[PDB]
Amino acid sequence: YTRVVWCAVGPEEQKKCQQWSQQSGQNVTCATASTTDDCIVLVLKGEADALNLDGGYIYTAGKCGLVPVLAENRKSSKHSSLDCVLRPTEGYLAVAVVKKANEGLTWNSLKDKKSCHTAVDRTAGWNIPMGLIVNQTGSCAFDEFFSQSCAPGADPKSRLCALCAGDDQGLDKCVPNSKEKYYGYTGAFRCLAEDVGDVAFVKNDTVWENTNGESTADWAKNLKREDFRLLCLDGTRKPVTEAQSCHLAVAPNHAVVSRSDRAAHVEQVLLHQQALFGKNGKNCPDKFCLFKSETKNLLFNDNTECLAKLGGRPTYEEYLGTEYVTAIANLKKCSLEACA
């Protein structure tokens, strides 16, 4: 009744949730699935209450009646006077990254190169990039643009999974969850750092968070920003400090979604939950922090300051914005539970 059932995607996320459930005294319990879409089915079924989602999945859920409840908010310099829970969300920059040593690689010479995506159906890792590529290309054969890629979610036998690696033993190749070495923002970036792929479709924050000694992770401790470049849409190549003038798009922050007849309940518990394990919670540092997972973005991106109220009690289309919504629609033209 006053308890929330969260849906975790994959084994690593289920571990962090179990910990969260334990520290909350059952105020929050977990449900597990192997993929985000399965997590959405559980929520529709009623066996799970909520889960945080990238804009790409919100589109999907939205059609199935789910609704955004709260959104993640990272630290910004403008809009200082206002608290985090009430402050407007700015969204993030989807960028295309490359190794600087890869001279001559530009947005115009990407065909047949090797791409690293966060996962199919995600904003910065799939929808924005393949969206632009389907339009400029005029074709729907985005499955043939790149020679080889790693796009968690696609057919394991296809070229779109050729570069993925699976887990420690090579099992779960290409599964859209943290078990895949190259899954998500971090996964896709590693995919480039290790020179597996030629280009990685992530977000501006990912580069910074994993370069210049910010990650301490063995595959990223020796990473230096200067050795990276962004691919702008005009054919130019700018430093990672010029993200504001060289990005593919601004994307809507990830957000917690739930069934509408529960949104109120999910919100109440969450706000309270975050006042205890949030950025400045009564018990985050000492006992448990909802927004930490040592660079893996488990349940929430590690750069989340807090979960913000929406205000305007927005529908999923409104939340995602008309801009992004068409982009997705146009792309989906090329391809219950896809509830319309």
Ligand X SMILES: *[C@@H]1O[C@H](CO)[C@@H](O[C@@H]2O[C@H](CO)[C@@H](O[C@@H]3O[C@H](CO)[C@@H](O)[C@H](O)[C@@H]3O)[C@H](O)[C@H]2NC(C)=O)[C@H](O)[C@H]1NC(C)=O
Ligand Y SMILES: *[C@@H]1O[C@H](CO)[C@@H](O[C@@H]2O[C@H](CO)[C@@H](O[C@@H]3O[C@H](CO)[C@@H](O[C@@H]4O[C@H](CO)[C@@H](O)[C@H](O)[C@@H]4O)[C@H](O)[C@@H]3O)[C@H](O)[C@H]2NC(C)=O)[C@H](O)[C@H]1NC(C)=O
Ligand Z SMILES: *[C@@H]1O[C@H](CO)[C@@H](O[C@@H]2O[C@H](CO)[C@@H](O)[C@H](O)[C@H]2NC(C)=O)[C@H](O)[C@H]1NC(C)=O
Quick check: 252 binds ligand NAG (CB under 6 A)? yes
- 172 or 205: whose CB is closer to ligand Y? 205
Opening angle at CA 124, ends 119 and 213, nearest 5: 90
Residues in Cβ contact with 126 at an 8 Å cutoff, skipping those fewer than 6 apart? 56, 117, 118, 119, 120, 151, 201
Instruction: Determine which residue in the list 41, 44, 132, 217 makes contact with ligand X, applying CB under 6 A.
Output: 132
Do strands 306-308 and 66-73 pair parallel, antiparallel, or not at all (unpaired)?
antiparallel
Instruction: Determine which residue in the list 49, 54, 180, 267 makes contact with Fe ion, applying CB under 5 A.
Output: 54
Quick check: 204 binds ligand Y (CB under 6 A)? yes
Residues in Cβ contact with 182 at an 8 Å cutoff, skipping those fewer than 6 apart? 116, 150, 152, 163, 164, 165, 188, 190, 191, 196
The type of residue at 213 is: G
DSSP-derived letter for residue 148 is E
Of 24-32, 96-104, 112-120, 186-194: span binding ligand Z (CB under 6 A): 24-32
Answer left, alpha or beta for residue 288, where phi above 0 means left and psi between -120 and 50 means alpha: beta
Here's the x/- map for ligand Y, 231-270, by CB under 6 A: it reads as ------------xx--------------------------
Instruction: Determine which residue in the list 18, 19, 27, 102 makes contact with ligand Z, applying CB under 6 A.
Output: 27
Quick check: 217 binds ligand Y (CB under 6 A)? no
Tokens of 197: 């792929």
Quick check: 29 binds ligand Z (CB under 6 A)? no
- 41 or 132: whose CB is closer to ligand X? 132
For 48-66, b/e burial (b = at least 16 CB within 10 A) is bbbbbbbbbbbbbbbebeb
Cα 191 to Cα 26: distance, rounded to the nearest angstrom? 38
Instruction: Determine which residue in the list 123, 177, 204, 293 makes contact with Fe ion, applying CB under 5 A.
Output: 123
How far apart are CB 303 and ligand Y at their closest, in Å?
6
Instruction: Determine which residue in the list 227, 287, 330, 339 makes contact with ligand X, applying CB under 6 A.
Output: 330
- 2 or 80: whose CB is closer to ligand Z? 2
Instruction: Determine which residue in the list 24, 36, 89, 293 makes contact with ligand NAG, applying CB under 6 A.
Output: 89
Radius of gyration over every alpha carbon of the chain, rounded to an integer in angstroms? 19
Confirm whether residue 190 is marked as ligand binding.
no
Quick check: 24 binds ligand Z (CB under 6 A)? yes
Residues in Cβ contact with 219 at an 8 Å cutoff, skipping those fewer than 6 apart? 190, 193, 194
The residue with its CB nearest to ligand X is 131
Tokens of 145: 């643009």
Cα 123 to Cα 15: distance, rounded to the nearest angstrom? 26
Confirm whether residue 92 is marked as ligand binding.
yes
Here's the x/- map for ligand Z, 273-302, by CB under 6 A: it reads as ---x--------------------------
Quick check: 135 binds ligand X (CB under 6 A)? yes
Whether the Cβ atoms of residue 303 and residue 210 lie closer than 8 Å to each other = no
Size of the site for ligand X (CB under 6 A): 7
Three-state DSSP at 249 gives strand
Quick check: 131 binds ligand NAG (CB under 6 A)? no
Question: Residues within the annotated binding site for hydrogencarbonate?
Answer: 118, 122, 124-125
Binding site for ligand NAG (CB under 6 A): 89-91, 250, 252-253, 319, 321, 323
